[PDB]
């Protein structure tokens, strides 16, 4: 039959062939020998700081490819505008070593990178992304204004809108525009004397970095961290987000009246800010993007992981469950309720959020659309399937082919 | 070359050097990862009408024999050397060779040990091995299979076992067990293409009827075994009801649960996989251990294409099945898994929940890291179908690759 990967859905018995994977120009971590697919950070995409300007030869072919994708998307491949834009990039790279993107080209690549993200289950919304062009930004102070504007438009008083703000691309031998915090909104992680952590253990390093930079630390379990913004060749400046801009949601349970007394809460805007956006060779080191949460992100990973808030035991104890024996499924029960609490608290506060059932179903729809439009959809199974009730959602039964397509979002080294 | 493996719950890190011993290829390539695929597109076990290339078979054998002698600390010894010459001698003259019982036993245990998808490998060292290469008829396979079942079941105190029938032979049919497990409930296609019983067993159920089985009309009708001897039409054999133990499902507090009339068998025994040791292929080598609650409560009873009883329990639990956000599905799933554990514990039948199971697997990873420098594991199969991140394995990176001896998938005999 077809000489492309055969993909099967064991629920419906249907079959497909991903032919889009042939389009992947970049290798991943696997080899016919062993599969390193479960690795979170395989040393592959990892955009390690490559100071000295890139091989004009390599950058060019990467650029020629993107421009082709662009004209193809506007249905003018082979046209005169297409060949001229091509000559325009080659010429520019010939005389300066790099090149720049047209407004509409940036919008297209930004959406494509989201569209190409293997780990994102909410890609059915890929077509609807507000792109803020901030390639004019020239100061860490200005970066803060842009971000504040982004948070304002994205939060939109609970009726969340996906968006991304693109700052100046990396320049030959010049400093990068970086955001030190992993997310625009992060709770503090206070290292205690006994060795424990107050707040979110995930953010201990960034919290300690904000202190070494002049932040006056609080002592709560949910203190919002300040942003460490870094303009080219300058030490990072520190900014404190206006509390009114950071919308949060106190958590309560629909029937367990005591849950509200736990004082648990979560912020509404999920915005990655430390990922690198790559388009046609150009690298955008600072390009924060945001959408809206899928309840399991808050209810299962952030609130229940061993290395995060780890509230499973406390909650189970309040439910009067037998936390002394694994066979009581006390973990499963408290997890369900905690997740139900996130959903209920967000809906009540009229803030955008989607549950893992609704989410995955729509991702199935996304796969069917992409199957027709591109002949496949790159997906990372372990990331698409929810952290709870896995085989209860439809993606669990859907085989998935994983691979790297550009534009793309890549991980990048911490500036420090 | 050697993959850095990290656990994101502890920050610990290890290097897998065991993958270096992989002489077989997977489906993955640097271009794209096909790891979430269940079956191999090409890594199958093609027919055996001709003899395997002696040069190759010989090298798989030499290596396995090396493996066997190293295991008993008699490497390079006299026995090791004279055993290699025996195998060289036999292969050169007949194009094949045979294994000695002890070697078989070593191989069988290694195959389990190398099983990437198995979460209960901490038990790999405790396996009762029944040598059934002394078998010559389907009627003999049946007796053999009945003993395995009697032993393995052990009145509810399950013990892990495997029974090995004759290896494959060039230009000769393979001994085969048509059924995928020694115990399966029939799947009867009724009215509107819907199904009564177990949907995954529609085909096997039909093939049985086609060979003279008097079908039933229940949701849990224990199927018969279609045993097949080389180049002979398969035969039908009914299992003695007293041999097939079963657990009726009821709930700790939900009085109405038992009313649902749900039940499941005690013995999980695969019978359609192939065991490969030192190049020799065993097409009929049924094996079993004991169920992990989630296989029953989550996959078998709740999969959409299986019994799919989720909505019923939800309605009985008087839940809001109008919307997804009420998490009525996650809620029912948990009570059903709770029921399976309760019922099995009440009937005194061996069973392990997914929390206990994954904790012990973590230990196994550790025991293996020190013992061989790594442990081949398929993440998507090790992490339970529910409460994934709630278990330790979820937060553990894993490397997957093929080691031999090994259990492999093989084409259906029909
Ligand atoms: C509209 C709602 C959206 C939802 C519900 C959604 C949900 C998710 C979830 C559940 C994850 C994985 C979380 C984890 O396991 O840590 C994820 C990852 C990701 N999403 Fe989305 N997403 C949405 C919007 C966005 C937007 C707007 C972009 C980009 C423009 C995007 C890009 C990505 C990328 C790159 C990843 C992987 C990041 C990594 O590797 O850590 N998502 N998304
Ligand atoms: C002691 C009890 C054992 C437990 C609790 C256990 C549990 C499991 C589980 C949960 C799976 C995945 C099942 C699925 O999702 O379909 C699995 C797969 C597997 N186990 Fe074990 N196992 C045990 C004993 C055995 C034994 C005795 C062998 C062989 C000697 C074995 C060989 C394998 C193999 C080959 C697979 C993968 C099969 C496939 O690819 O379909 N297991 N085991
Ligand atoms: N997850 C969403 N619902 S919207 C996309 C941004 C996002 C927000 C929060 C978490 C992660 C997952 C990766 S977290 C990281 N690489 N800093 C992504
Ligand atoms: N799973 C256990 N508790 S013991 C191993 C036997 C076993 C029983 C049930 C299911 C599967 C996995 C897929 S079954 C197959 N490849 N026909 C293996
Ligand atoms: Zn892979």
UniProtKB/Swiss-Prot annotation, chain A:
Q: Where in the cell is it found?
A: Cell membrane; Membrane, Caveola; Cytoplasm, Cytoskeleton; Golgi apparatus
The record lists L-arginine as bound by: 183, 292-293, 297, 302
Could you tell me which residues carry Phosphoserine?
50
- The organism's superkingdom is given as Eukaryota
Positions annotated to bind (6R)-L-erythro-5,6,7,8-tetrahydrobiopterin: 38, 382-383, 396
Regarding protein family, the annotation reads:
Belongs to the NOS family.
Assembly and binders: Homodimer. Interacts with NOSIP and NOSTRIN. Interacts with HSP90AB1. Forms a complex with ASL, ASS1 and SLC7A1; the complex regulates cell-autonomous L-arginine synthesis and citrulline recycling while channeling extracellular L-arginine to nitric oxide synthesis pathway.
Record's protein name? Nitric oxide synthase 3
What is the source species? Answer: Bos taurus
In terms of the parent sequence, the fragment covers 67 to 482 of 1205
Swiss-Prot record, chain B:
Q: How is it modified after translation?
A: Phosphorylation of Ser-48 by CDK5 reduces activity.
Segment of the intact protein contained: 69 to 482 of 1205
Q: Name one GO biological process term.
A: blood coagulation
Localization per Swiss-Prot or TrEMBL: Cell membrane; Membrane, Caveola; Cytoplasm, Cytoskeleton; Golgi apparatus
Residues the record lists as binding (6R)-L-erythro-5,6,7,8-tetrahydrobiopterin:
36, 380-381, 394
Binding positions for heme b per the UniProt entry: 118, 409
User: Which residue positions does Phosphoserine occur at?
Assistant: 48
- Residues annotated as binding L-arginine are 181, 290-291, 295, 300
The answer to keyword NADP applying to this record is yes
State the family named in the UniProt similarity comment for this chain.
Belongs to the NOS family.
- Molecular-function GO terms, alphabetical: calmodulin binding; flavin adenine dinucleotide binding; FMN binding; heme binding; metal ion binding; NADP binding; nitric-oxide synthase activity
Keywords for the protein's UniProt record, in alphabetical order: Blood coagulation, Calcium, Calmodulin-binding, Cell membrane, Cytoplasm, Cytoskeleton, FAD, Flavoprotein, FMN, Golgi apparatus, Heme, Hemostasis, Iron, Lipoprotein, Membrane, Metal-binding, Myristate, NADP, Oxidoreductase, Palmitate, Phosphoprotein, Zinc
Q: What is the top-level taxon of the source organism?
A: Eukaryota
Its function, per the record, reads:
Produces nitric oxide (NO) which is implicated in vascular smooth muscle relaxation through a cGMP-mediated signal transduction pathway. NO mediates vascular endothelial growth factor (VEGF)-induced angiogenesis in coronary vessels and promotes blood clotting through the activation of platelets.
Identify the stretch(es) annotated as Interaction with NOSIP. Answer: 32-414
Task: Report the protein name in the record.
Answer: Nitric oxide synthase 3
Identify the species of origin. Answer: Bos taurus (Bovine)
């Amino acid at each position: 039959g077809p000489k492309f990967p055969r993909v099967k859905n064991w629920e419906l018995g249907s079959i497909t062939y991903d032919t889009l994977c042939a389009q992947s120009q970049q290798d991943g971590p696997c080899t016919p020998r062993r599969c390193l697919g479960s690795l979170v950070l395989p040393r592959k995409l990892q955009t390690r700081p490559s100071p000295g300007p890139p091989p004009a030869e390599q950058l060019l072919s990467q650029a020629r490819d993107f421009i082709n994708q662009y004209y193809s998307s506007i249905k003018r491949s082979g046209s005169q505008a297409h060949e001229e834009r091509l000559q325009e990039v080659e010429a520019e790279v010939a005389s300066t070593g790099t090149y720049h993107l047209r407004e509409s080209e940036l919008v297209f690549g930004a959406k494509q990178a989201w569209r190409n993200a293997p780990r994102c289950v909410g890609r059915i919304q890929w077509g609807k992304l507000q792109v803020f062009d901030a390639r004019d930004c020239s100061s860490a102070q200005e970066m803060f204004t842009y971000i504040c504007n982004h948070i304002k438009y994205a939060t939109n008083r609970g009726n969340l809108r996906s968006a991304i703000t693109v700052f100046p691309q990396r320049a030959p031998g010049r400093g990068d525009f970086r955001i030190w915090n992993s997310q625009l909104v992060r709770y503090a992680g206070y290292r205690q004397q006994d060795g424990s952590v107050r707040g979110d253990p995930a953010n201990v390093e960034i919290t300690e970095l904000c202190i070494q930079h002049g932040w006056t630390p609080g002592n709560g379990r949910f203190d919002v961290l300040p942003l460490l913004l870094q303009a080219p060749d300058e030490a990072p400046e520190l900014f404190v987000l206006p509390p009114e801009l950071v919308l949060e949601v106190p958590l309560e349970h629909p029937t367990l009246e005591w849950f509200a007394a736990l004082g648990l809460r979560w912020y509404a805007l999920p915005a990655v800010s430390n990922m690198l956006l790559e388009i046609g060779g150009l690298e955008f080191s600072a390009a924060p993007f945001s959408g809206w949460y899928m309840s399991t992100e808050i209810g299962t990973r952030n609130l229940c992981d061993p290395h995060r808030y780890n509230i499973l035991e406390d909650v189970a104890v309040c439910m009067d469950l037998d936390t002394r024996t694994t066979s009581s499924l006390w973990k499963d029960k408290a997890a369900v309720e905690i997740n139900l609490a996130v959903l209920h608290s967000f809906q009540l506060a009229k803030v955008t959020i989607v549950d893992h059932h609704a989410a995955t179903v729509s991702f199935m729809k996304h796969l069917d659309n992409e199957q027709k439009a591109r002949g496949g959809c790159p997906a990372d199974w372990a990331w698409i399937v929810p952290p709870i009730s896995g085989s209860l959602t439809p993606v669990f039964h859907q085989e998935m082919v994983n691979y790297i397509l550009s534009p793309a979002f890549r991980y990048q080294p911490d500036p420090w």
